[PDB]
Structures are given as structure tokens and as C-alpha cells.
């Protein structure tokens, strides 16, 4: 997680000039950036509105009637990178791997990237991957080491392994 400064342009419309534009610009910003994700900065958790909100500009458009208000803001973002170790929350367990979940990003732990001590049990009450006393079901945050990440359509997706020491059940 990071706290960084980002930019964003708000293109306002005459109808909302009034005498409290500042508010409108801020309201529009929160709505356009919060919840979004990019490969470059990742998930834009939320914007630290108030104090950390600059409103520069702006220059009205010639053939449009709309003015562009540049905005500098502080936000909390969640960008992952290959090699980072994170705690995740297992969601599903299929003979295909481990569908974990960290915050808002989805991490997939291919079965081939899981120790050979965790056999897959489909008969056991709730499909799990025990060994080896250690039992990893749909309720046991595991530790993984991102091996590779990808960014397809603003969205991000990477694969993690459990091959190193000090990884696995938490």
C-alpha cells in the first residue's frame, strides 16, 4: 500500500458553475478515481480529500463550453510487484490451485506451485489441501511470494508460489 500524489482532470459543465464549484470539482473527483485501477499505479483505494486537495486552472474550452480543472490529490493505492510477500485470504480450494484474495486484488496459487506435501482432498467435508497436519481450507490466510504479475485492462493479475521457506499456512 502506498500514499501517493496523483493527477486527474475534471471537465466541468456550465450548468454547474454556481458559487460552490470547488465542492462540485471535489465531488466529481472522488467519483471518477476512487475504485479505479491502473497497471501504472494500481488500485486507487481512496483519495485523501481535505487539505491534500489542490485545485488549479482552469481554461475553458473554445468549441465545447466546458472548462478543464486540473487536480492534484493524495490517494491510498494498492500496487503489487513480483517478489513481494503478502498475507492473503483463501476464498476457494479446487484441484486446480488456491484462489486466495488480498484486499481487492485476486491472487491465484497454481497447484503446481504448491508443495508436494499438500495433497488435494475432495472427499473431506469441505474440499481442502492438507498434508501434513496443516490444513488449508476456505478459511486460512496463506503467505505467498508473487512470482509474476500482469495488467490486462487497467486490471492487474499475477501468480504466486509457495516454494520458498516460511511460506504457506499462517
Amino acid at each position: 500500500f502506498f500514499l501517493k500524489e496523483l493527477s486527474l482532470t475534471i471537465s466541468l459543465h456550465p450548468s454547474y458553475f454556481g458559487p460552490r464549484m470547488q465542492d462540485y470539482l471535489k465531488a466529481k473527483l472522488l467519483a471518477d478515481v476512487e475504485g479505479t485501477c491502473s497497471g501504472q499505479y494500481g488500485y486507487i483505494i481512496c483519495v485523501l480529500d481535505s487539505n491534500t486537495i489542490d485545485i488549479d486552472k482552469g481554461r475553458v474550452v473554445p468549441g465545447q463550453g466546458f472548462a478543464e480543472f486540473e487536480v492534484k490529490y493524495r490517494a491510498v493505492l494498492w500496487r503489487p510487484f513480483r517478489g513481494e510477500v503478502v498475507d492473503a485470504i483463501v476464498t476457494t480450494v479446487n484441484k486446480m490451485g488456491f484462489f486466495a484474495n488480498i484486499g481487492p486484488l485476486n491472487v491465484f496459487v497454481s497447484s503446481h506451485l504448491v508443495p508436494p506435501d499438500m495433497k488435494f482432498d475432495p472427499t473431506a467435508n469441505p474440499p481442502n489441501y492438507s498434508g501434513e497436519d496443516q490444513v488449508i481450507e476456505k478459511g486460512s490466510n496463506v503467505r505467498l511470494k508473487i512470482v509474476g504479475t500482469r495488467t490486462d485492462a487497467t486490471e492487474i493479475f499475477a501468480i504466486a508460489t509457495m516454494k520458498e521457506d516460511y511460506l504457506g499456512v499462517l
Binding site: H13, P14, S15, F17, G18, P19, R59, V60, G65
Partner: protein, 83 residues
């Protein structure tokens, strides 16, 4: 490469230029024509421009003018400032 200039040490002419009047009135026209917050008691007009002119006369119209210098610097002027 801009540079911005001091709202206190302005160089250019205090009067509003032949061309500017023409651009401002052009600009607010479109604005109001686009349902916008009109800043002077509506005399009872119809023409998104003939109205803007009612504004100009009373210097009660938003919009400012950035006058780019050759340097690359600029100056900002307020319709109420100008002449």
C-alpha cells in the same frame, strides 16, 4: 515553457482589446446558451449573447484572459479589471 507573471507586476495594457471583447462575449454566449448561471438580473432577454452583453456592460462576468508573452510567460486579467 511557461513562467507565469506577478499579479502585482503586470506589464500589458490595462484596457480590453478589440479582439478580446469579441472573444469573451463569444465565450459567455456559448456558456449561457448552455444553460449556465447568469450573473446579472435577467432584463428579460432571449439571446444568449445580447444577454452576455448586458453582463459585459456591468463588468459582472466571470472568465479571465491569459495573455501569453513571447517569452512564454503570461498574465491573467479579470473582466472587472479591464477597460
Amino acid at each position: 515553457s511557461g513562467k507565469a507573471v506577478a499579479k502585482e507586476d503586470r506589464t500589458t495594457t490595462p484596457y480590453m482589446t478589440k479582439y478580446e471583447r469579441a472573444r469573451i462575449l463569444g465565450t459567455r454566449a456559448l456558456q449561457i446558451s448552455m444553460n449556465a448561471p447568469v450573473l446579472v438580473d435577467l432584463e428579460g432577454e432571449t439571446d444568449p449573447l445580447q444577454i452576455a452583453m448586458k453582463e459585459l456592460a456591468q463588468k459582472k462576468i466571470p472568465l479571465l484572459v491569459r495573455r501569453y508573452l513571447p517569452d512564454g510567460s503570461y498574465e491573467d486579467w479579470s473582466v472587472a479589471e479591464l477597460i
